């Protein structure tokens, strides 16, 4: 019956600030402590601090004091966390939890970046040489410099699914970059076409990139 409902994901600029909310229901809000936690991607949970709604007293992990400010609204049964002077180390999922870590909100992802919405550049990844016959060849697509997440990558518009995987994106210098891999029999390429399809809904772009053999040729991209 206890529920904690947080606000959605945010994109914020470095040096700016962001306010996250956690609406509580199903229990008397003033009788329990509220907690805020941080989780950098791929890393562990960190405790930010608590706020007791009955008097809005607060205690912080010393590491976050001044960086995070907790507040609570007794009538609305909502706790807020405000993050100030953001930097890239602040991109993370932030969680709300009721004492004693008994119930949890779903998490709110905060992404800090100076970037404007930016469609990906899509680049072919073809072998540098050493073609081997009667085997498998691995090709790929480099999806680079886009913002914000996400992108969808498909191969031969779904025809090539055997031996396909896309690596998770990495946010570097304010923009994301990811690559996707596909493995097909050598008898099927280059004799038959292999193409990656890349969708980026924030920028409304959709692009196809045929993979062709490497050589010293210039301008393959104007034709593929």
């Amino acid at each position: 019956q206890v529920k904690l409902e947080q606000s959605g994901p945010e994109l914020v600029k470095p040096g700016a600030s962001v306010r996250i909310s956690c609406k509580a229901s199903g229990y008397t809000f003033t009788n329990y402590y509220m907690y805020w936690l941080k989780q950098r991607p791929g890393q562990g949970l960190e405790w930010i601090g608590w706020i007791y709604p009955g008097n809005v007293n607060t205690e912080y992990n010393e590491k976050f004091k001044g960086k995070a400010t907790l507040t609570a609204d007794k009538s609305s049964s909502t706790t807020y966390m405000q993050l100030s002077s953001l930097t890239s180390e602040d991109s993370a999922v932030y969680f709300c939890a009721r004492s004693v870590f008994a119930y949890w909100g779903q998490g709110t992802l905060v992404t800090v970046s100076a970037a404007k919405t930016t469609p990906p550049s899509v680049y072919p990844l073809a072998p540098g040489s050493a073609a081997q016959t009667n085997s498998m060849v691995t090709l790929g697509c480099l999806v680079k410099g886009y913002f914000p997440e996400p992108v969808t990558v498909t191969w031969n518009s779904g025809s090539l699914s055997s031996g396909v995987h896309t690596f998770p994106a990495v946010l570097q210098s304010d923009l994301y970059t990811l690559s996707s891999s596909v493995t097909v029999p050598s008898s099927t390429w280059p004799s038959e076409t292999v193409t990656c399809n890349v969708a980026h809904p924030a920028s409304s772009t959709k692009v196809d990139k045929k993979i062709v053999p490497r050589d010293c040729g210039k301008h393959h991209h104007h034709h593929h």
Binding site: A102, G107, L125, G140, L142, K144, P168, S181, H221
Partner: protein, 214 residues
Amino acid sequence: DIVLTQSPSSLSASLGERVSLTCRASQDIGSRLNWLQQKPDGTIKRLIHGTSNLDSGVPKRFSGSRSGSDYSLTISSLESEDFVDYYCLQYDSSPFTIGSGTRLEIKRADAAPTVSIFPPSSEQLTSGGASVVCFLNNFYPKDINVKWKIDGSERQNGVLNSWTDQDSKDSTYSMSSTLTLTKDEYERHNSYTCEATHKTSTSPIVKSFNRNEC
């Protein structure tokens, strides 16, 4: 400032096996230790509170116990939904602290990676950049080393690695390594190499290309 040391950070295990995660507290914390579970979609749930009480909605395969300053979460018979992240935490003193967590993964036999190196495409060079990429695909166990060399000299700056999640169908891992240089730097050198080494390797796997060659 209590330190909780959770171990191991990665636990390989199999369906139906019994396993025990451990959390050693740097100071006496009595019974005030909780265990949390975190699913891949990011959601978190408390499994146990006060060292041994199961939380409502927790299957009884989960149990928790204590032995001196060593606390343990035990799963009697692993189900597939259990290969996820787990964290211990203490509320005996503030600030509250959390262990670094444990990820359960599926054990399988050793598998050598397939390594591919990809020279930058012509398009990228016209825009001023040069990303060389290397794929290390379908290997097991997850740990692996990758090294970039430019004309025989190892390069560590400008390198960015990314790992896939354990594959749902064959339990292998894959990793991509991308080296990004200015277009001008890439043209000052000829040879480029991705060198991988894994526990399955008798010798390192060397993949390379020469820029002035086709």
